Structures are given as structure tokens and as C-alpha cells.
């Protein structure tokens, strides 16, 4: 997503916090002055941008493509060195529940837990490595060109013009979704990389036309909403259960 859809993504999590997760939360985000979940959610995509060590390294991690095998993810096929979306979330999950560790190396691992469980629900995430998750497929959205990749990133939501204040309680506005029973942090990643890859690969969403505006809008926008609200309650039942259990 873009820097909305993170942010929103974060917020729609941070509501739904148990209260030992919330507790752990605000203990690794006190250790950077003013962060919050919101502020943080943004950040992998940042340090992709400036940072020319761990932000070059990193990059593959925001993203795995698997629509050229049906959506099917195998590790040593998509991810041998384990620099992909699947891979860097079990990992990074693994590092914010290691309570050995200090808390400024735990705050790293949630920046990317709350980066990554964003990215990994957002479709052309998951989508053709032959068109770079979309990158590669320009076309025009109203009198503007773009490319799919970012149309779904950001394109489609910015037609709201709402701020964090008013697309949030839009997408709290939304049926629930149906949520697995439990988080597995090992497992749900791939099964979350594979659900977002069949909606890349859905009737309709790589359009027919070079051309598209509102019908486009109309039917995939909701999809994207739904994709935000899904990935904030994926994303907090997962602190919930990283953060949110010691006794026993
Ligand atoms: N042409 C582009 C495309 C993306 N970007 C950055 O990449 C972010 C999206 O990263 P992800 O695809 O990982 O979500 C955007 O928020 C923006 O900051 C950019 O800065 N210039
Ligand atoms: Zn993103
Ligand atoms: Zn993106
Ligand atoms: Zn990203």
C-alpha cells in the first residue's frame, strides 16, 4: 500500500489490541519518542528508499511473486535466501516475540511486522513477476497515466479524498470479515500471500482496456477496502498472540 493504506492498516489493528499486547506495544514504541503504530506502519517502505544497506537488502521483502504458478508459493522456487514477503514475516514475527531481546531490536521487528502484514493483503503484492507485481503494466485512470501496482496501492483509495479521520470508521463501517479461529505466525503467511495472488489473478482486476476510470473504481475499490480492514484484524489477532500471552 501506500502511506494511507499502511497507516490505516495499523489503526484499524491498534483498536483491537488485548490489553497485555497493547501494554507490550506502547513499552517497545515509548523507546522512540512519539511513534505510534500509525506513524511506524510506513516506515519499511522509508528505509527502502533512504537506507542504501538494509533498505537494498530488504526490498524483496515486500512483495512475492507466485500468480505464474497459480498461486501456489514453494520457498526454494520464490524465496531461496529468504528475501521475500512470506519468509521476512515469519521471521520478523519470530524476532518481536523474542523477549531475550532489547526493546529497541523488538520496535525494529514490529516496524516490519506492521510494514509487511499491510503489503501482504494488498493483491499485486502476490501477483506476475513478469510485470513486477504490476509496476510494468502502465495505463490511464481518468486523464491520468499510472500503472496497476500503484493504482491499487494508493489510485483507488486517494478517490475518497478522506484523511486517516475519515476513511477509518469507513472501513470499521464494513462487515466483519471471517477470520482463521487462531493466528498461526509460522503458517498464516503463506496462506495470506496465496489468498491476495488470486485476487491478482480474479476475472477483471488486469483490466481489458489500456483506459479505465469509475466502472474500475466502482467494482475493485471495495475489494482494496475490504483488503485494509482484513489485513488490520489479521494484523492484531497476530500481536495478540506474539505480544498477548506469558502465563504457562
Ligand atoms: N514511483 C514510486 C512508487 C512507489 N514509491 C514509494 O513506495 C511506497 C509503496 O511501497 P510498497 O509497494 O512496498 O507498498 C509508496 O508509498 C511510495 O512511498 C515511490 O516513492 N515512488
Ligand atoms: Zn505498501
Ligand atoms: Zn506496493
Ligand atoms: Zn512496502
Not at 138 to 147: A, D, E, P, V, Y
Amino acid at each position: 500500500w501506500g502511506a494511507q493504506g499502511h497507516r490505516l492498516v495499523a489503526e484499524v489493528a491498534d483498536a483491537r489490541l488485548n490489553p497485555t499486547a497493547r501494554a507490550e506495544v506502547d513499552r517497545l514504541l515509548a523507546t522512540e519518542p512519539d511513534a505510534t503504530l500509525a506513524s511506524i506502519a510506513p516506515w519499511a517502505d522509508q528505509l527502502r528508499a533512504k537506507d542504501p544497506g538494509l533498505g537494498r537488502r530488504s526490498a524483496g521483502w515486500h512483495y512475492v511473486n507466485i500468480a505464474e504458478d497459480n498461486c501456489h508459493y514453494e520457498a526454494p522456487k520464490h524465496c531461496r535466501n529468504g528475501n521475500c514477503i512470506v519468509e521476512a514475516l515469519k521471521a520478523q514475527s519470530t524476532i518481536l516475540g523474542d523477549r531475550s531481546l532489547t526493546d529497541g531490536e523488538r520496535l525494529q521487528a514490529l516496524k516490519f511486522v506492521v510494514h509487511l502484514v499491510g503489503d501482504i493483503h494488498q493483491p499485486m503484492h502476490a501477483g506476475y513477476a513478469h510485470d513486477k507485481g504490476g509496476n510494468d503494466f502502465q495505463l490511464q485512470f481518468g486523464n491520468r497515466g499510472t500503472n496497476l501496482h500503484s493504482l491499487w496501492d494508493s489510485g483507488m483509495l486517494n478517490t475518497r479524498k478522506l484523511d486517516d479521520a475519515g476513511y477509518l470508521p469507513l472501513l470499521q463501517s464494513q462487515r466483519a470479515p471471517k477470520l482463521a479461529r487462531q493466528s498461526n505466525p509460522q503458517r498464516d503467511p503463506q496462506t495470506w500471500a496465496e489468498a491476495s495472488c488470486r485476487i491478482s489473478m480474479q476475472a477483471g482486476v488486469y483490466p481489458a482496456t489500456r483506459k479505465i476510470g469509475d466502472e474500475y473504481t466502482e467494482r475493485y475499490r471495495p475489494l482494496a477496502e475490504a483488503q485494509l480492514r482484513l489485513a488490520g484484524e489479521n494484523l492484531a489477532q497476530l500481536l495478540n498472540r506474539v505480544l498477548g500471552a506469558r502465563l504457562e
